[PDB]
């Protein structure tokens, strides 16, 4: 039965892949990094507190200037902050209050957001009549939008619960490229520093690297025991970290095509919600559900510092592009800047 | 350059006072999530009360109730978008004797969710008239699907409607206790389940959600002051 013959050749391929993976596993990252000195205790403190949201914040994204940032809360609002002076620059009401992601275009001209309406909405901040309003609205997903990030002022990538990611042409509103292959809900995506590729973490406990311009999945990494909730890129561009519900963080390399390190303690039994590296990639910040944020040493797997101060699950985080500070959004309806 | 600082300060002032009016509106709206299988009565309940969303007012108190429709079936992650809702309205078909275990398992998975640990559920045991039809016909008996029903005794606190066959009373109170046996098994008083017998033609199913949202707020305020 040709279905059983495809299942057999499938397993044959899975064992050729496991062998080609153990073939290049000549060492471990811990043996390599055992002679480095530990980063020491890193105790950042709340330098700013950005209040205003009436409900749980669910997504945030710094701007390129490392000064403004946007936060999306499920009270139906999308607030833009001037993080230096804690002033609000804009307060965009949303037609659907169940927003789940929000992005800030690298030109600072547009903001995007989407959620259970299955629609990615673009808002022009540099409007000419005065006020930011809707410009485009990207439809096509049969599932909820979990993450989205601009490439430029006309290309935007989305992640959805229909187990697909899509590259959009904001003007025509057409999905210029579709990325399919994930079995479970895609929860987070992160574009590489050179826009050329991007990764996605899905609820099938797998991460996938996608070629933006060609629309094919190049590599699929596994190892997590449950849903991947957050993902980033290492600042270099050849590695990325994932956090999943199994209370573990894992660092994958693109060129070696397998996991390098797992970040865990047997007293943490909670699901990681957001991940992000520092500017040099030495520090990996993760936002567990147990209201804390752990700052891990991305090279030694040692836990180094904690960011306590939230009264509910820390839902999101993000490091500035200059590396000057990190922001944390939580379900307590507050964002806190740390440095 | 201080002038742009004063312009930013008055932009912040206009923002905060718009956000204050928005805060009062958001503070007085009770969000309700409608959940339940298809081949049930959720959409009929929304049609009778009068999309994804519904907005209705009871006694000058507005509610906006939403049932999510265009998703897949793995609701394990968008469900956490409703951790702060006032109540979950769970609709079940009492007349579908074998997809009823699916409803019990979904209620159990919702009730023990780590992020809906404090969300009380209003249980609508819908389609009671068809259930009475099936019970009086005696062609598909509950014991073949739930053998506990053979030894089950109608509770002494039961209030049957005029003319109701004791077989129907035992059937609907058995489904009632099948869901209450789950809700009382692990609720540490943070939340409760409120069963109600409904049919597709019932018109008061808004006053019931009002009554029980009020009861949920009462019990939250009690358990807050350590009384209850």
């Amino acid at each position: 039965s040709e279905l059983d013959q495809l299942r057999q050749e499938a397993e044959q391929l899975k064992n050729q892949i496991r062998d080609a993976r153990k073939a290049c596993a000549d060492a471990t990252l811990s043996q390599i990094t055992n002679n480095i000195d530990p980063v020491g205790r890193i105790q950042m403190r709340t330098r700013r507190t950005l209040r205003g949201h009436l409900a749980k914040i669910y997504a945030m994204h710094w701007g390129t200037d490392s000064r403004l940032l946007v936060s999306a809360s499920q009270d139906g609002k999308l607030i833009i902050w001037d993080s230096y002076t804690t002033n609000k620059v804009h307060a965009i009401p949303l037609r659907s209050s169940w927003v789940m992601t929000c992005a800030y275009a690298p030109s600072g001209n547009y903001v995007a957001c989407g959620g259970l309406d299955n629609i990615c909405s673009i808002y022009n901040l540099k409007t000419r009549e005065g006020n930011v309003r809707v410009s485009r609205e990207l439809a096509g997903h049969t599932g909820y939008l979990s993450c989205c990030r601009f490439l430029d002022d006309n290309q935007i990538v989305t992640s959805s619960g229909d187990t697909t990611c899509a590259l959009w042409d904001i003007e025509t509103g057409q999905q210029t490229t579709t990325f399919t292959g994930h079995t479970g809900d895609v929860m987070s995506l992160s574009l590489a520093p050179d826009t050329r590729l991007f990764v996605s973490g899905a609820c099938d406990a797998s991460a996938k690297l996608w070629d933006v311009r060609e629309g094919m999945c190049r590599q699929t990494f596994t190892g997590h025991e449950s849903d991947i909730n957050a993902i980033c890129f290492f600042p270099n561009g050849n590695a990325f970290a994932t956090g999943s519900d199994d209370a573990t963080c894992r660092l994958f390399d693109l060129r070696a095509d397998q996991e390098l390190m797992t970040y865990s303690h047997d007293n943490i039994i909670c699901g990681i919600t957001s991940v992000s590296f520092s500017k040099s990639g030495r520090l990996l910040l993760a936002g567990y559900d147990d209201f804390n944020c752990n700052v891990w040493d991305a090279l030694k797997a040692d836990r180094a510092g904690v960011l306590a101060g939230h009264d509910n699950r820390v839902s999101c985080l993000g490091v500035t592009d200059d590396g000057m500070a990190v922001a944390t959004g939580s379900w307590d309806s507050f964002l806190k800047i740390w440095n | 350059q201080r002038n742009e600082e004063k312009a930013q300060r008055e932009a912040n002032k206009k923002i905060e006072k718009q956000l204050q009016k928005d805060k009062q509106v958001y503070r007085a709206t009770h969000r309700l999530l409608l959940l339940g299988a298809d081949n049930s009565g959720k959409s009929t309940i929304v049609k009778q009360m009068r999309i994804f969303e519904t907005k209705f007012q009871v006694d000058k108190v507005n509610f906006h109730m939403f049932d999510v429709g265009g998703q897949r079936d793995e609701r394990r992650k968008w469900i956490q978008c409703f951790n702060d809702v006032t109540a979950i309205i769970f609709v079940v078909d009492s007349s579908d004797y074998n997809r009823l275990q699916e409803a019990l398992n979904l209620f159990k998975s919702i009730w023990n969710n780590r992020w809906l640990r404090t969300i009380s559920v209003i249980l609508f045991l819908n389609k009671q008239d068809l259930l009475a039809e099936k019970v009086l016909a005696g062609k598909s008996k509950i014991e073949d699907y739930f053998p506990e029903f053979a030894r089950y005794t109608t509770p002494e606190d039961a209030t049957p409607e005029p003319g109701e066959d004791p077989r129907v009373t035992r059937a609907k109170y058995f489904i009632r206790d099948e869901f209450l046996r789950i809700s009382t098994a692990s609720g540490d008083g943070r939340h409760y389940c409120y069963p109600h017998f409904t049919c597709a033609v019932d018109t008061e199913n808004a006053r019931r959600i009002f009554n029980d949202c009020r009861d949920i707020i009462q019990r939250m305020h009690l358990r807050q002051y350590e009384l209850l």
Partner: nanobody
Amino acid sequence: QVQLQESGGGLVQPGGSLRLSCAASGFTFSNYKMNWVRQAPGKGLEWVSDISQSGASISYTGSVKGRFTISRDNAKNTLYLQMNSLKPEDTAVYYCARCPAPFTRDCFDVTSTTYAYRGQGTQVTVSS
């Protein structure tokens, strides 16, 4: 990579017996609540029985209550659905599902088409 291999299950006359062995590889077996989801031909997925983190609390669908048992062995990393007195309607594929989160009591794993942490199936057939 989480993968679940079921074994056992073949043509068995009514009132017969079988034992379905679900071996799990790729995670920590003890943390996860396990279920048996069977699919009869022409109908959606159906949930049979679940066993808790350590075999502490087990629970059954009504139709298989008093007939089948469900045992978990963390040593060999597996669980077994021992079926006895099989009826002509217990003929179905038997996926061995895992709940999607450790250290918790909820799961949503009877899904319509695609759930990522259940196996492939051992078609158990029962007829005369």
